[PDB]
Design an enzyme around this catalytic site. Structure first.
Site, PDB file in Angstrom:
ATOM      1  N   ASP A 138       0.809  -1.214   0.000  1.00  0.00           N
ATOM      2  CA  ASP A 138       0.000   0.000   0.000  1.00  0.00           C
ATOM      3  C   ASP A 138       0.845   1.268   0.000  1.00  0.00           C
ATOM      4  O   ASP A 138       0.295   2.369   0.126  1.00  0.00           O
ATOM      5  CB  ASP A 138      -0.961   0.035   1.195  1.00  0.00           C
ATOM      6  N   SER A 139       2.163   1.152  -0.142  1.00  0.00           N
ATOM      7  CA  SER A 139       3.014   2.329  -0.206  1.00  0.00           C
ATOM      8  C   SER A 139       2.736   3.098  -1.497  1.00  0.00           C
ATOM      9  O   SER A 139       1.929   2.692  -2.338  1.00  0.00           O
ATOM     10  CB  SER A 139       4.484   1.927  -0.107  1.00  0.00           C
TER      11      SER A 139
END
Ligand SMILES: [Mg+2]
Ligand SMILES: [Zn+2]
Ligand SMILES: [Zn+2]
Ligand SMILES: [Zn+2]
Ligand SMILES: [Zn+2]
Ligand SMILES: [Zn+2]
Lengths: 43, 94, 56, 43, 109, 321, 134, 532, 100, 426, 65, 56
Positions: free
Chosen positions: G4-5
């Site tokens: 999810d970066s």
């Protein structure tokens, strides 16, 4: 051995009719004189 | 940072006893305390400058051994002594 | 829900959702999904602490 | 050395002196920016 | 921290026996009889009272008389209180009750 | 003599023969003294290190100043106030005894002294009032000081703070080896390892010392043989110091330096593993993508801790175990 | 951008993307400990002073308060307060060790009891970085 | 809520304790001001208070006769006692106030504090809950009676059915306040005045056709048959909790007073008509029996209909009441000392400041059960965060525990509490935020409603004749069984028409249940309502 | 300020002594030619509210049986004037000197 | 007379009732007022309460003399801060001591006695005691009163009554202030023995002779016989050390045996002598002493450095202090003279930034022309914090130009070093 | 079985025995020896017997029997 | 056992019974700050004076 066993038994619990899951593990670990959902199997 | 109990048991599982000893005795509070070989109590009068060792509780002159323990250990021992509980630290097995 | 009359056991009134996220959810379906999510969050919150205590 | 929040007039008061504006009763008594050279970069 | 001639060796066992009042008196170098923790003018600690220099160094720059050490290298010392009237121990209250029930109230048998 | 049914009500027990009466503390102490060796030996009390009489405390040791640190905001701790109150109660009782003992107020004074002693040893007593400190807080007792998380047992012995360590966010990095972890330059400078001076790396240590604490490939302290530590930043003659064998220098962590990496929720064994330090010019820890799974990392602001070993033994154990 | 970066454009970051201004206010009072004794806001001169922190007192003006536009970092003293002792002990409010920036404003007023009160607001410009969360 | 409080509740509290053995006529509140030492009092604005960390409060002036400054009441922003309320956008800018700011907080020592809505169980309502099998009790019906006007006190009256299923002992005992030993309902009815057993059964059971209720109550009347006189019942009630008194000498009157006041205080506080208490007890027993027989579903606590959200209004009212009582005691002691003015205003101002500072909502700081967390520092990270915080609600239940049922949002939350907005963690399921179109009832006087109902044709509860009136709808106002009506449909339609027209305050909630044939009217504050 | 008489132990405010003096020892003080203040002291220990001095054993113990009901001090510090002592051969100080 | 006042069951009956401590006086007054009101109102029917009292030393309780418990319970009913249930009957034998006045802790005041004022904490001498035993004259130190200073400062309020009597601010005699204060406001031979009290407290020795209660013992510390009273000796079962003392303006010695008032010190010449506490002018602070010497090899030696003698026994030890021509060295391997020996320095071998606090601009770097504030210098490099960047960078000072506090011209690192350190002119 | 007494004015000197089979409540003091008897019911308690005894004593004292 | 939830009660019980601890447990060594008999710490390392000569 004891610590490895403790970690291996605890990790699945964190990851996670008849009682099951964390409540069942807690009941099994404890004496659990009274059973929430007692069961018996006969063949 | 705080070295939590979970990390402590994880390192115990890793088997790095030396790492834990260094972390809890070198990277943390470190103290050196003197205990007699008969009474095994930290209440020992030790003048390092004069190199004079004597414990009032027991009539002994030179029966003193030095042990490296965290300051928390001696604090707990003193607190127990306040409760009339005396952890008798001995360097030999009976 | 107040939008349903008494003794309404139809799936739409019993938490069933017949529309995917792509098309959207009706207000009743949205409320049911919110209730399910709240139940899941509360279960996770209690069970993480229980599992940590068991591990200890 | 000092300015008023409302009047915005210089006071230049000294030690052991009232911190209230002379023109008005307000006593916020803000201070002007330092005369020392200041530099900034867009980076 | 400081060179010591005492032999170095880790502890191997720790007995947890009770601390006798006689041992308390023998080891208690000083005596506490002044409730005030400081003397007049709040400059010197009360002599023979709480925070006495004999027990330890109340503040830095002063060396404990018993050990001639300041905050560091000074474990500390305890004082003995007369306590003429005996006082039941909260921790052992159950133990005291059990012992009394287990022994005669007159012959102590 | 019949044995009364001894009850447990309040600080002072009451025995019933039936007539209920408070058993004298002196009588109980005398009975304990009269106990023979065999009796309490069978009961389980070791004569050498324990006795039934010793249970009845006739003297309260006074903790030394270290056990009762002064805030000096002096600002004596609540335990000191409790000790002072106990001493005042004892003094008043002694004065009353020496100034005529009516035997009525004597009982009240003795009960007050017992309550004060119990609160000092155990502030929280079930089914009894808790002593209130002069300030708006309950008085802290030794038993309370040893209760759990905040207690010394689990607050300072099982888990205690660490000097050499860092904590900060973690970010993914596909360009790092599996066992290689990125480390901020600032954290590397702050964290140091006490490497002992040896002929093998004498030149490297001298170069690091010449570089100084400000420069990352350097050091901040040079421990001499006597053990005294000299700061490099405060000393303007750092370059004039000649290293000698047997000394130790706190050098900044370099590349290929094993260090433990962990996340606070150490649920399983594989939540704390050794990684090789790789200095990077950023303020975020960087680790291999795979090691996220054993750590359960998510990179959504997750903060992890890095511990730097401070001895050859620790480094070898971390690298091998 | 795994787990999810995200990946953010450096050019946009330096061109005005998600830049932030952080304002931190420090308050100081001359609370009196005993009648006829009060604190004084003046620049310490090392004379008859026992307590002196590492904070640089040069930034302090004659009044003892840093004016807007003065660089402050580390433990630099923001408000210069000394409590007389009976000659005086420094009681300045050092800047946060882990935070630094440019002092934005300083104001001096009187409390309910009339005691001198100072409030200094420091403004810092923070640019998005890798560790920042969005 | 704050406006209605400052307008009416302050005056009501002053009047309740105005009498003394001295008397307070009226209370006046001025604009915010600061009394600086060695200075002249002047108007104070929120911006000035925040900059100078001053308390944004208005002084209170009360006339005393045989005006005195009693203290300073904090003034909420955007209220009717602040300058910014009577200020336009240009005026707000001239005052250095953001027009977008919604106020709704208290400026104490410069810090902005907001009081979070506190959820409580609604009073004057009977809730029936089952009991665990190990416990001998089967069903317990509890009502938290409390005065809705003044001198509020908690009266938790519980009636318990002893004996589980098949225990062969179906007895019901009511725990009268200050009476540890539970007494049978029969003795209570005898003490009230309903001596005949048939009258007691008729009051308990309305429809004589249902013989199951009579069969279940037969043990109750069998055990209560021992008592047949009012004096004996009062003596038996007074037996427990003896305080060195004579039952026959000045104790029957004491028990009668306890029954008049302690038993169902909300319904009435006078001895002129004590039959209303008997009827209410009969209704409670009927509900308990219906729940036991399973014909009525068990009550749920999560339902908002039985819950009230007290805002800053009631909390400030309680804090006032307490501080004013303390000041009255202090001045009474001062007058007693002055055997042959001097009002300590700080006693109230400092107390309010402490309550709004540390969040300890208690009569004094010495109390450790103040239930901290009522007041929280307003979060101004962003405008949306401030709006959410200002409209936040809190649950008194401790953040600890692992009971998921209360944490889960009930279906009643539709349109009242945001289904999604909720903190994640321990506070999850306890801290709630109200929806956009959600408002909290500020309260209104119910007396006009009672008068209208009585004049419209509502028969008095005293004249109620259930045996000759098989069909009748009970009318409940604030949990008080005022009486019954024969044409519920017409009365309900008239009430709805009047409320829509605007004659009656719309905040009042009227609910008619045909299945139970019951009419409930609610006017108490803390009730959540939405427009449709 | 409250002062306790050194003769009878009655405790009263200084204003009462200045205005009316000791209600039980005014005659003795007038005979001795001394002021009430000189025969009263501000230091006292313990308070006794006597209601029935004639039927109270405490009054007999404190030698205030013949005195009136009111507030009295168990212990009063100081000494009465020599003239008062000469007029009271059997006087017993209330400071505890003669309680050996 | 007191023999006839013995309490009896039929004559005395006092019950103790628990109450909130400290409120004893107020509670007693309230109960007395209530009793008076009841007597005035009820009339003939009066509660049988004979007396209500309390003891200051016995807090939290009151005593009521009544013939029956029920009367007390009725009288005390409804009274706050009184626990009627928590009551006990006072036995007759305990009644006397209950009313017995407490023995005041204040010792009988005598002329010339020393006391402490409760000038708090200042010793005072009792000069005279009033006939009424209510006020006492105390002589105290005001520093002694100085008539010269008083005359110089406040002559208006200063008066002279006698050659040694001065009155200041309304009586000083012989430099001391006399003021009135309220009383309430004020063994066998060869036995090992040790001194517990006296001038020689802490001394230990071996007894040799006992006669007429005086015990003579040879002391190891002094190696001489000392005779002390037996009561001051206890039978024992069988300035600090190394401090530097300035004996005179040119004599410095090191202590090898630190006693109470007797100190054994080795001087710079190596002679060891025993002196008294008064012979020491002051203690030299080794840490604050900036004294250095040159060894045979030329390497600088400071305090604490380990050195080894080139000749003799090659004693190794740490230097404690450095004298003009000698150095004192303490060694842990030597017990003689507490391991402290004085050796010549030649016979042993060892084993102001102007930039700081001034705005600067960098010249040759990646941040040239950027304003910076100098924090510290580590030698040949200066640490500067950039105004526009929250980072500290180390750059050589020679390549930085200094500016005035407020603007001004830029100057390189060639004028401050040469010219006197001064900021340029704006 | 501990209650106050009126004749001897001694606390906790009273003991009450309730025979439900015979429905008799007997109150006896261990100091003054006073004994009283009354009729009791299954729901009776010792407080009821004490109140009945007190009422009987009051009636006897008043002489209105 | 002291490190478990029961902390002071176990200490009082040990004091009453004068229990002796061999310090072979992990908690004992951790409290004492000594190398516990765990893995590396289970054994001890010594020096062979006969192999040293030939290895030199
Ligand atoms: Mg994450
Ligand atoms: Zn020893
Ligand atoms: Zn102005
Ligand atoms: Zn010490
Ligand atoms: Zn026996
Ligand atoms: Zn009796």
């Amino acid at each position: 051995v004891g610590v490895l066993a403790a970690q291996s038994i605890g990790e699945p619990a964190t990851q996670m009719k008849v009682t099951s899951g964390v409540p069942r593990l807690k009941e099994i670990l404890n004496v659990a004189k009274n059973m929430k959902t007692p069961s018996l199997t006969v063949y | 940072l705080r070295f939590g109990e979970m990390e402590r048991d994880c390192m115990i599982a890793h088997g790095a006893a030396s790492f834990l000893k260094e972390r809890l005795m070198e990277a943390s509070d470190a103290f050196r305390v003197h205990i007699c070989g008969i009474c095994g109590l930290m209440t020992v009068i030790a003048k390092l400058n004069h190199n004079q060792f004597e414990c009032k509780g027991c009539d002994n002159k030179i029966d003193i051994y030095q042990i490296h323990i965290p300051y928390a250990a001696k604090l707990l021992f003193q607190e127990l002594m306040a409760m009339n509980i005396t952890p008798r630290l001995y360097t030999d097995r009976s | 829900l107040p939008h349903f009359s008494k003794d309404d056991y139809s799936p739409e009134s019993k938490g069933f959702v017949e529309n995917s996220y792509l098309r959207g959810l009706t207000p009743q379906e949205f409320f049911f999904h919110a209730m399910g999510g709240r139940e899941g969050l509360i279960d996770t919150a209690v069970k993480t602490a229980e599992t940590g205590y068991i591990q200890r | 050395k000092y300015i008023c929040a409302e009047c915005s007039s210089k006071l230049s008061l000294s030690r052991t002196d009232a911190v209230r504006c002379k023109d008005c009763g307000h006593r916020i008594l803000l201070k002007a920016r330092t005369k020392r050279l200041v530099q900034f970069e867009a980076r | 921290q400081q060179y010591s001639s005492a032999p170095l060796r880790t502890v191997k066992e720790v007995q947890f026996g009770l601390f006798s009042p006689e041992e308390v008196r023998a080891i208690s170098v000083a005596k506490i009889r002044f409730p005030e923790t400081m003397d007049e003018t709040q400059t010197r600690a009360k002599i023979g009272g709480l925070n006495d220099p004999r027990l330890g160094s109340i503040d830095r720059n002063l060396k404990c008389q018993t050990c001639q050490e300041g905050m560091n290298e000074c474990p500390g010392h305890f004082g003995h209180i007369d306590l003429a009237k005996p006082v039941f121990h909260v921790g052992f209250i159950a133990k005291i009750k059990k012992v009394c029930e287990c022994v005669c109230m007159h012959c102590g048998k | 003599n019949t044995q009364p049914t001894i009850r447990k009500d309040g600080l002072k027990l009451v025995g019933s023969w039936p007539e209920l009466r408070v058993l004298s503390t002196e009588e109980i102490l005398n009975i304990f003294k009269h106990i023979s060796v065999k009796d309490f030996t069978s009961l389980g009390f070791n004569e050498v290190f324990s006795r039934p009489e010793w249970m009845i405390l006739t003297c309260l040791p006074v903790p030394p100043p270290p056990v009762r640190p002064s805030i000096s905001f002096r600002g004596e701790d609540d335990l000191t106030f409790k000790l002072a109150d106990i001493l005042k109660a004892n003094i008043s009782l002694e004065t009353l005894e020496h100034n005529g003992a009516p035997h009525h107020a004597i009982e009240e004074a003795e009960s007050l002294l017992q309550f004060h002693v119990a609160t000092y040893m155990d502030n929280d007593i079930a089914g009894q009032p808790q002593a209130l400190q002069k300030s708006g807080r309950p008085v802290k007792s030794i038993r309370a000081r040893l209760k759990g998380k905040e207690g010394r047992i689990r607050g300072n012995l099982m888990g205690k703070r660490v000097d050499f360590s860092a904590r900060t966010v973690i970010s993914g990095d596909p360009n790092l080896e599996l066992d290689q972890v990125g480390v901020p330059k600032s954290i590397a400078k702050t964290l140091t390892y006490p490497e002992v001076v040896t002929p093998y790396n004498i030149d490297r240590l001298t170069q690091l010392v010449r570089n100084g604490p400000n420069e990352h490939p350097g050091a901040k302290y040079v421990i001499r043989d006597s053990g005294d530590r000299i700061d490099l930043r405060y000393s303007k003659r750092a370059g004039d110091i000649q290293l000698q064998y047997g000394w130790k220098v706190e050098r900044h962590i370099m590349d290929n330096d094993p260090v433990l990496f962990n996340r606070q929720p150490s649920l399983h064994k594989m939540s704390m593993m050794a990684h090789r330090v790789k200095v990077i010019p950023y303020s975020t820890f960087r680790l291999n993508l795979s090691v996220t799974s054993p750590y359960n990392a998510d990179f959504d602001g997750d903060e992890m801790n890095l511990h730097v070993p401070q001895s050859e033994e620790t480094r070898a154990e971390l690298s091998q175990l | 951008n795994q787990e999810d970066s995200m990946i953010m454009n450096q050019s946009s970051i330096d061109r005005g993307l998600f830049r932030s201004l952080f304002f931190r206010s420090y308050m100081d009072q001359e609370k009196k400990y005993g009648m006829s004794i009060t604190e004084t806001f003046e620049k310490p001169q090392r004379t008859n002073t026992l307590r002196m922190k590492h904070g640089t007192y040069d930034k302090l003006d004659d009044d003892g308060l840093i004016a807007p536009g003065v660089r402050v970092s580390g433990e630099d003293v923001i408000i210069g307060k000394t409590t007389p002792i009976s000659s005086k002990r420094d009681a300045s409010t050092p800047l946060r060790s882990t935070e630094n920036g440019i002092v934005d404003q300083v104001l001096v007023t009187t409390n309910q009891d009339g005691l001198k009160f100072v409030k200094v607001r420091v403004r810092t410009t923070k640019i998005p970085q890798i560790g920042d969360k969005f | 809520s704050f406006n209605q409080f400052v307008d009416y509740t302050l005056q009501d509290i002053i009047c309740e304790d105005s009498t003394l053995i001295i008397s307070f006529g009226k209370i006046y509140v001025t604009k915010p001001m600061v009394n600086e030492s060695d200075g002249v009092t002047h108007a104070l604005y929120p911006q000035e208070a925040r900059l100078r960390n001053l308390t944004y409060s208005s002084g209170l002036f009360v006339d005393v006769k045989k005006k005195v400054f009693i203290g300073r009441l904090p003034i909420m922003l955007r209220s009717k006692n602040c300058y910014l309320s009577e200020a336009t956008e240009s005026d707000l800018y001239k005052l250095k106030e953001c027009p977008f700011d919604m106020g709704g907080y208290f400026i104490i020592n410069g810090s902005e504090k907001v009081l979070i809505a506190q959820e409580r169980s609604a009073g004057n309502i009977v809730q029936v809950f089952k009991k665990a099998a190990p416990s001998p009790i089967s069903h317990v019906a509890e009502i938290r009676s409390a005065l809705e006007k003044g001198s509020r006190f908690i009266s938790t009256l519980q009636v318990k059915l002893y004996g589980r299923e098949g225990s062969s002992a179906r007895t019901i005992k009511a725990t009268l306040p200050y009476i540890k030993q539970d007494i049978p309902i029969v003795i209570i009815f005898r003490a009230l005045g309903i001596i005949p057993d048939g009258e007691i059964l008729e009051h308990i059971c309305y429809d004589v056709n249902d013989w199951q209720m009579l069969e279940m109550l037969k043990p109750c009347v069998e055990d209560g048959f021992v008592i047949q006189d009012r004096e004996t019942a009062l003596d038996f009630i007074g037996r427990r909790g003896t305080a060195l008194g004579i039952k026959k000498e000045k104790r029957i009157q004491y028990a009668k007073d306890i029954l008049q006041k302690e038993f169902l205080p909300h319904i009435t506080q006078l001895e002129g008509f004590e039959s209303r208490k008997a009827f209410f007890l009969g209704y409670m027993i009927n509900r308990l029996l219906l729940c036991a027989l399973d014909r009525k579903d068990q009550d749920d606590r999560d339902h908002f209909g039985k819950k009230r959200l007290d805002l800053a209004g009631p909390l400030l009212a309680q804090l006032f009441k307490t501080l004013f009582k303390k000041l009255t005691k202090d001045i009474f002691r001062y007058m007693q000392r002055t055997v042959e003015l001097a009002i300590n205003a700080k006693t109230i101002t400092s107390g309010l400041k402490y309550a709004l500072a540390t969040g300890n909502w208690g009569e004094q700081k010495k109390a450790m059960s103040s239930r901290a967390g009522v007041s929280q520092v307003l979060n101004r990270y962003t405008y949306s965060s401030t709006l959410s915080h200002l409209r936040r609600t809190n649950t008194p239940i401790g953040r600890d525990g692992k009971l998921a049922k209360p944490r889960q949002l009930h279906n009643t939350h539709w349109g009242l509490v945001c289904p999604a907005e909720t903190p994640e963690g321990q506070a999850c399921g306890l801290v709630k935020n109200l929806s956009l179109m959600s408002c909290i009832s500020v309260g209104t006087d119910p007396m006009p409603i009672i008068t209208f109902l009585s004049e419209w044709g509502m028969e008095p509860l005293e004249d109620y004749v259930p045996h000759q009136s098989p069909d009748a709808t009970r009318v409940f106002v604030n949990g008080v069984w005022h009486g019954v009506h024969r044409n519920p449909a017409r009365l309900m339609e008239t009430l709805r028409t009047l409320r829509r027209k605007g004659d009656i305050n719309p905040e009042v909630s009227m609910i008619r249940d045909i299945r139970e044939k019951e009419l409930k009217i609610f006017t108490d504050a803390g009730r959540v309502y939405r427009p449709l | 300020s409250e002062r306790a008489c050194m003769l009878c132990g009655i405790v009263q405010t200084t204003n009462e002594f200045n205005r009316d003096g000791c209600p039980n020892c005014q005659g003795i003080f007038e005979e001795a030619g001394v002021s009430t203040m000189e025969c009263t002291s501000p230091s006292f220990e313990g308070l006794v509210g006597m209601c029935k001095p004639t039927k109270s054993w405490v009054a007999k113990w404190l030698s205030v049986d013949h005195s009136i009901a009111g507030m009295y001090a168990i212990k009063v510090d100081g000494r009465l004037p020599a003239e008062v002592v000469e007029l009271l051969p059997h006087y017993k100080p209330r400071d505890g000197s003669q309680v050996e | 007379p007191q023999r006839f006042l013995l309490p009896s069951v039929d004559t005395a009956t006092i019950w103790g009732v628990r109450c909130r401590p400290g409120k004893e006086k107020e509670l007693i007054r309230k109960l007395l007022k209530k009793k008076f009101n009841l007597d005035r109102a009820m009339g003939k029917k009066k509660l049988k309460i004979l007396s209500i009292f309390q003891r200051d030393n016995y807090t939290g309780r009151i005593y009521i003399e009544a013939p029956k418990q029920s009367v007390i319970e009725k009288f005390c009913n409804g009274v706050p801060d009184i626990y009627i249930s928590q009551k006990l009957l006072i036995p007759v034998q305990e009644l006397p001591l209950l009313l017995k006045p407490n023995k005041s802790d204040d010792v009988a005041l005598e002329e010339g006695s020393y006391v402490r004022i409760k000038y708090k904490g200042d010793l005072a001498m009792v000069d005279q005691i009033s006939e009424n035993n209510l006020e006492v004259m105390l002589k105290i130190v005001p520093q002694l009163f100085n008539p010269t200073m008083a005359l110089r400062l406040d002559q208006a309020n200063l008066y002279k009554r006698d050659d040694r009597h001065f009155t200041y601010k309304n009586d000083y005699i012989d430099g001391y202030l006399y003021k009135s204060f309220r009383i309430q406001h004020v063994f066998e031979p060869g036995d090992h023995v040790t001194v517990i009290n006296g001038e020689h407290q802490g001394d230990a020795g071996l007894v040799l002779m006992v006669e007429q209660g005086q015990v003579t013992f040879m002391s190891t510390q002094t190696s001489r016989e000392v005779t002390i009273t037996a009561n001051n000796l206890s039978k024992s079962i069988d300035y600090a050390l190394h401090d530097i003392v300035e004996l005179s303006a040119k004599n410095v010695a090191c202590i090898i045996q630190a006693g109470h008032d007797i100190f054994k010190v080795i001087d710079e010449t190596g002679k060891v002598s025993t002196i008294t506490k008064g012979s020491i002018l002051s203690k030299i602070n080794t840490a604050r002493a900036r004294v250095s010497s040159v060894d045979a090899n030329g390497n600088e030696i400071k305090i604490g450095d380990t050195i080894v003698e080139k000749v003799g026994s090659r004693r190794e030890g740490q230097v404690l202090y450095i004298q003009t021509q000698q150095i004192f060295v303490v060694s842990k391997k030597i017990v003689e003279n507490a391991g402290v020996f004085v050796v010549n320095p030649s016979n042993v071998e060892a084993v102001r930034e102007v930039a700081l606090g001034k705005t600067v601009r960098i010249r040759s770097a990646g941040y040239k022309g950027q304003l910076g504030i100098v924090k510290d210098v580590n030698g040949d490099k200066a640490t500067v914090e950039l105004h526009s960047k929250n980072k500290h960078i180390t750059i050589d000072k020679h390549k930085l130009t200094y500016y005035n506090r407020e603007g001004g011209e830029g100057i390189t690192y060639d004028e401050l070093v040469n010219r006197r350190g001064r900021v340029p002119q704006a | 079985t501990k209650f106050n007494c009126l004749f001897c004015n001694h606390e906790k000197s009273v003991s009450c025995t309730l025979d439900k089979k015979n429905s008799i409540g007997t109150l006896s003091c261990k100091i003054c020896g006073q004994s009283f008897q009354t009729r009791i019911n299954s729901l009776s308690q010792p407080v009821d017997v004490y109140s009945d005894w007190f009422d009987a004593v009051e009636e006897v004292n008043s002489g209105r029997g | 056992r002291c490190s478990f939830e029961e902390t002071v009660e176990i200490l009082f019980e040990a004091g009453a019974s004068a229990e002796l601890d061999d310090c072979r447990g992990v908690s004992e060594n951790v409290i004492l700050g000594q190398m516990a008999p765990i893995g590396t710490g289970a054994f001890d390392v010594m020096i062979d004076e006969e192999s040293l000569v030939k290895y030199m």
